[model samples]
Target: SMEQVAMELRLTELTRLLRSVLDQLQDKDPARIFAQPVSLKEVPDYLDHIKHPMDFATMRKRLEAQGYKNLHEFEEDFDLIIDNCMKYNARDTVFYRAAVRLRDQGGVVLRQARREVDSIGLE
Candidate 1:
C-alpha cells in the first residue's frame, strides 16, 4: 500500500538519524564504559542501585529494530544511561562527573540533532 511505503520511508529515515546520534555519543565516550552491559560482579551492587539498566548496544538493537517511535523516546534511553551513572556513583567519582559531561555536552549535541535531523541522510 502507498501508506505502508510512506511509513517504511519514515521509519528508515528515523533509524538513520538515531544511528548518527548514537555514533556521535560513542565517539565522544572514550572510556567506552557505556558501550555494553555492565557485569554485576564487576560493579558490585550495580543492579541494586539502578534497576533499569541501559547501554549503547541495547539502544542500537532497539533502534535497528524500529523500537523507538520518536526522538523523545530515543532521548529517554540516552538519558537513562547518563542518569544511571550519575545516580549510582557518588558526586566525586569519575563516573558521576563523566555523566555530567555527557549530559552537558552530549545533551546539547542531541538537542542540535533533534532540530536539524528533522531532516535525514536518507540512510
Candidate 2:
C-alpha cells in the first residue's frame, strides 16, 4: 500500500516544475553580487570579556542568568534582537527580505498543489 501510494505521488516532478518557474522569476530579479565587510574588529575582545569561567557549575549558572522564564518572552526577545540587527544593517535586510519572499512564493505553490489534489479527489 505504501509503495502504491508513493508511486501515485508526483512530488519530485512537482518540485522540478516549481524550480523551473522559480529560476525564471529569479532571472527577472537577479540576485545582487556585492562584497560585505566583516568589521567586527573588537568582537573577540568583547566576547572574551563576557566569557564564562572554566567551571561547569559556574558556566551553567552564568548561562542560566540570561535565560527567559517564558517561551513566548524568549521568542519575542529573539525576534526583536534579529529584527533590530537587520534594521541596522542594509545588506542583511536585503538578504532577509529575499529569503522571506522566496519562502512565501514556494509556500504558495505548495498550497495550490494541495488544493488541486483535494479538488480532484486524489488523496
After TM-score superposition, the amount by which residue 110's alpha carbon in candidate 1 deviates from its true location, in angstroms, is 1.7
Show model 1 residue runs off by greater than 4 Å: 117-123
Tens-digit lDDT track for model 1 on 10-118?
7877777788999988888889888999997888888888989999999999998889888889999999999999889889998888889888887887888777655
Q: What is the lDDT of residue 116 in candidate 1?
A: 64
Give the per-residue lDDT digits (tens) of candidate 2, residues 15-107. Answer: 333344334434433542111222348334423332211212222242345432322332243233234334443554675565455445634
Q: For residue 35, give model 2's deviation from the true position in Å.
A: 18
Error of 1 at 15 (Å): 0.5
